[PDB]
Scaffold this active site. Structure first.
Site, PDB file in Angstrom:
ATOM      1  CG  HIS A 184      38.207  47.607  43.232  1.00  0.00           C
ATOM      2  ND1 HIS A 184      36.201  47.542  43.357  1.00  0.00           N
ATOM      3  CD2 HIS A 184      38.052  48.595  43.567  1.00  0.00           C
ATOM      4  CE1 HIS A 184      35.030  48.463  43.711  1.00  0.00           C
ATOM      5  NE2 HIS A 184      36.439  49.160  43.904  1.00  0.00           N
ATOM      6  CD  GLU A 185      40.497  50.459  44.380  1.00  0.00           C
ATOM      7  OE1 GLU A 185      40.394  51.499  44.402  1.00  0.00           O
ATOM      8  OE2 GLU A 185      40.331  50.428  45.801  1.00  0.00           O
ATOM      9  CG  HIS A 188      37.431  52.663  40.408  1.00  0.00           C
ATOM     10  ND1 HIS A 188      36.028  53.093  40.577  1.00  0.00           N
ATOM     11  CD2 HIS A 188      37.547  52.190  41.713  1.00  0.00           C
ATOM     12  CE1 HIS A 188      35.429  52.437  41.151  1.00  0.00           C
ATOM     13  NE2 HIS A 188      36.603  52.279  42.566  1.00  0.00           N
TER      14      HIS A 188
END
Ligand SMILES: *[C@@H]1O[C@H](CO)[C@@H](O[C@@H]2O[C@H](CO)[C@@H](O)[C@H](O)[C@H]2NC(C)=O)[C@H](O)[C@H]1NC(C)=O
Ligand SMILES: [Ca+2]
Ligand SMILES: [Ca+2]
Ligand SMILES: [Zn+2]
Length: 388
Positions: A184-185, A188
């Site tokens: 998820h990170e 980004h």
């Protein structure tokens, strides 16, 4: 070189066991291996794609933070889920974080996130873009607890991932070991680089664009961890281990049942904050993915097979269309424009072979042909194009 890790596809310590894996890099994406930038070779969690360390201070420098000195190149370190003091497994934490992020670098590279696409590498070896921007991978980051984050400067400046300890459980749980959160990170960084092209990192600041920013990471983590037995009836959550709740960190499971997950585009008018908005976005992409899987099958291996440049299965095809859509959508996009960019990505990639699979998933959750964006007063639609 070896790594003792929960390997790729095992999301977290509650879902599998560690083993030792050798030379886990893909040389098509990491031509120098993970441990070199082409000029220097390292004996630690450092190389072309990232540099990993613990950051107990919570500060913004990284080079002199602790990382394991292992000239053996055996990155095999003790770890137990009963251990109460997280610094005692910092070596394992750093190594796992380095492993997961480098694996994801490699997968995204195969899906098109290369040097010329604005990816994160020290040395771009003549393949375009700007280097000097490997990811700074901070484990056990002292800036906070119960969260993680990612900072994406423009191409040529490193991305920075902060992974924190989570303290909704005893023992505390280290989110270096929650692969979906790592993914998820890092996503980004993917979406901020691709959207508006690599020189513009201000394209997903908040509101609906920032909501998709959250959704894309949840989607990518979900897609990567689809299992052999899964079908469109499977429901999926995010971060259930590190967060210590079976619901995971979002308000509903990713589901194709509108009973299990009721969100449609109109719901976004009532949702508050980018993570709530992104829960809707990741649900739409989940719907689209299952349409593609039901059509093309799914490849449970860790990299796609390609037919004439196109992933042969629906799981990696969905990931590829989502990535490609990021390169076509406007800066500061809304969800109608992002839908259209995914459809346009399929037009470019497959000559429009999946038009109706994509529209069916969007239409089912209110992003049909009549949908209109407004910050406060969106208009939703469940209508399909005639071709479908
Ligand atoms: C730095 O690391 C690279 C990558 O591991 C080394 O390149 C390998 O060199 C051996 C022979 O020395 C070859 O058999 C391998 O095929 C090479 N690997 C790759 C990926 O190219 C390189 O030798 C190292 N440099 C030094 C000075 O030790
Ligand atoms: Ca770069
Ligand atoms: Ca960008
Ligand atoms: Zn996020």
């Amino acid at each position: 070189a070896t790594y003792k890790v929960y390997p790729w596809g095992v999301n977290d310590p509650s879902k599998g066991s560690r083993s030792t894996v050798e030379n886990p890099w893909n040389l098509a994406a990491s031509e120098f291996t993970w441990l070199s930038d082409g000029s220097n070779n390292y004996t630690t969690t450092r190389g072309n794609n990232g540099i990993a360390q613990v950051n107990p201070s919570g500060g913004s420098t990284y080079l002199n933070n602790y990382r394991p000195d292992s000239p053996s190149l055996k990155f095999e370190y003790d770890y137990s889920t009963s251990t109460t003091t997280p610094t005692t497994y910092r070596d394992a934490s750093i190594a796992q974080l380095f492993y997961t992020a480098n694996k994801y670098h490699d997968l995204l590279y195969l899906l098109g996130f290369t040097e010329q696409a604005g990816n994160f590498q020290t040395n771009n070896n003549g393949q375009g873009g700007v280097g000097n921007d490997m990811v700074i991978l901070n484990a056990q980051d002292g800036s906070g607890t119960n969260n993680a984050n990612f900072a994406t400067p423009a191409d040529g400046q490193p991305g920075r991932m902060r992974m924190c300890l989570w303290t909704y459980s005893t023992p505390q749980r280290d989110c270096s070991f929650d692969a979906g959160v790592v993914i998820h990170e890092y996503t980004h960084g993917l979406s901020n680089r691709l959207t508006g092209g690599p020189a513009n990192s201000g394209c997903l600041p908040g509101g609906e664009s920032g909501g998709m920013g959250e959704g894309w990471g949840d989607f990518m983590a979900t897609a990567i961890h689809i299992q052999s037995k899964d079908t469109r009836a499977s429901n999926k959550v995010m971060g259930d281990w590190v967060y210590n709740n079976a619901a995971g960190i979002r308000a509903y499971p990713y589901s194709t049942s509108l009973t299990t997950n009721p969100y449609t585009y109109k719901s976004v008018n009532s949702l508050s904050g980018v993570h709530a908005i992104g829960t809707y976005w990741a649900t739409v992409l989940y719907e689209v993915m299952w349409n593609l899987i039901d059509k093309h099958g799914k490849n449970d291996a860790d990299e796609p097979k390609f037919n004439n440049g196109v992933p042969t299965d629906g799981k990696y095809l969905a990931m590829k269309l989502v990535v490609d859509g990021m390169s076509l959508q406007p800066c500061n996009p809304n969800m109608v424009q992002a839908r259209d960019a995914i459809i346009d990505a399929d037009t470019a990639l497959t000559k429009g072979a999946n038009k109706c699979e994509i529209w069916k998933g969007f239409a089912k959750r209110g992003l049909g042909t009549g949908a209109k964006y407004s910050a406060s007063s969106r208009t939703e639609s469940f209508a399909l194009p005639s071709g479908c």
